[PDB]
From Swiss-Prot:
Protein name, as recorded: 3',5'-cyclic-AMP phosphodiesterase 4D
Family, as annotated: Belongs to the cyclic nucleotide phosphodiesterase family. PDE4 subfamily.
Subunit organization: Homodimer for the long isoforms. Isoforms with truncated N-termini are monomeric. Isoform 3 is part of a ternary complex containing PRKAR2A, PRKAR2B and AKAP9. Interacts with PDE4DIP. Identified in a complex composed of RYR1, PDE4D, PKA, FKBP1A and protein phosphatase 1 (PP1). Isoform 5, isoform N3 and isoform 12 bind RACK1 via their unique N-terminus. Binds ARRB2. Interacts (via N-terminal region) with SHANK2 (via proline-rich region); the interaction is increased in a PKA-dependent manner.
Function, in words: Hydrolyzes the second messenger cAMP, which is a key regulator of many important physiological processes.
Organism, scientific name: Homo sapiens (Human)
Catalytic residue list: H75
Tissue spec: Expressed in colonic epithelial cells (at protein level). Widespread; most abundant in skeletal muscle.
Positions bound to Zn(2+) 1: H79, H115, D116, D229
Length: 322
């Protein structure tokens, strides 16, 4: 059909920063995660490498995508697809050519796909403050991130969903550990330590990059997926602005729930006292730029255009304040 033709055209940009992910979400019948993951697996020849039956891959992806919430403005299947695609581009950076094994690549992409599954659209702190079942289950420690992993892995046990059925026991064990390490590293409470470790690696860099032990390799993959998670402000402005609209809607809905419960409204969650532009500038200045500038240093000069875009977008948001 004409719609499938346009979808195919948009997917030709799967290896490019700035893919039209929202268009792909609409054109695919709200299956951005499934089609983008399928496309990336085909591009990297992962189905052949790991003997993943095509029908099994699609069944699992659709099932996984179904577990992202349709009514959460930001932490939905589009965000998952975007992080998957951004990770895919970061993995292809020239400075990392031939550094990671096929299993490591698979782990990073799979981790990206499941990293926010079944997100309720409220933060770890909200879950902790409201004595939620999730916080009680996970003892207030990386509550959501533990849950995303539990769901992502559990779904593999559904009928015709085990995409790792042909991996060896050793490969399955290794992949499981890497995926857990990567998704737990997406908790923002770990951001400062992750960044500190990334800077230490840049300072002791040996060169393409030379990573010999699990600690260094996993650290890079953790930071890579974390960069993808924090990549919105580095994308072309039309995409960035949509991500900002969505995160603010989600935050405002949390603030509304907090207000209904008589709780104090969390930072940036009060629709009656918000500064969207100032908040984006602060977000870039204190979190996004420090991380991306460090990533850019590790893979210099591969990420120069991404960092330039980030800086341009920071200047644009800042210009709307006066
Ligand atoms: C497009 O703007 C934003 C996008 C993403 C996030 C953000 O914190 N994402 C995130 C969250 Cl909410 C939790 N764990 C990890 C990540 Cl990366 C935060 C954003 O803006 C901040 C939050 C509200 C205003 C500043
Ligand atoms: Mg998350
Ligand atoms: Zn995320």
């Amino acid at each position: 059909t004409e719609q499938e033709d346009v979808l195919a055209k948009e997917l030709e940009d799967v290896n490019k920063w700035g893919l039209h992910v929202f268009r792909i979400a609409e054109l695919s019948g709200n299956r951005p995660l499934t089609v983008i993951m399928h496309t990336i697996f085909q591009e990297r020849d992962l189905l052949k490498t790991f003997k993943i039956p095509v029908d099994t891959l699609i069944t699992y992806l659709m099932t996984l995508e179904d577990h992202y919430h349709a009514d959460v403005a930001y932490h939905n299947n589009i965000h998952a697809a975007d992080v998957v695609q951004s990770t895919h581009v970061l993995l292809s950076t020239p400075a990392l050519e031939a550094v990671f094994t096929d299993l490591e690549i698979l782990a990073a992409i799979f981790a990206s796909a499941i990293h926010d599954v079944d997100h309720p659209g409220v933060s770890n702190q909200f879950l902790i403050n409201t004595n939620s079942e999730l916080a009680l289950m996970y003892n207030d420690s990386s509550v959501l991130e533990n849950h995303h992993l539990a769901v992502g892995f559990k779904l593999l046990q559904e009928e015709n969903c085990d995409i790792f059925q042909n991996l060896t026991k050793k490969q399955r064990q290794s992949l499981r550990k890497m995926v857990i390490d990567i998704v737990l590293a997406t908790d923002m409470s770990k951001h400062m330590n992750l960044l500190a470790d990334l800077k230490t690696m840049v300072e002791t860099k040996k060169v393409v990059l030379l990573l010999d032990n699990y600690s260094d390799r996993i650290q890079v993959l953790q930071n890579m997926v974390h960069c993808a998670d924090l990549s919105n402000p580095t994308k072309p402005l039309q995409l960035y602005r949509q991500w900002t609209d969505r995160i603010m809607e989600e935050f405002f809905r949390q603030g509304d729930r907090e207000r209904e419960r008589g709780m104090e409204i969390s930072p940036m969650c009060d629709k009656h006292n918000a500064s969207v532009e100032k908040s984006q500038v602060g977000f870039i200045d204190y979190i996004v730029h420090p991380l991306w500038e460090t990533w850019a240093d590790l893979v210099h000069p591969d990420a120069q255009d991404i960092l330039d875009t980030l800086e341009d977008n920071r200047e644009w948001y800042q210009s709307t304040i006066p």
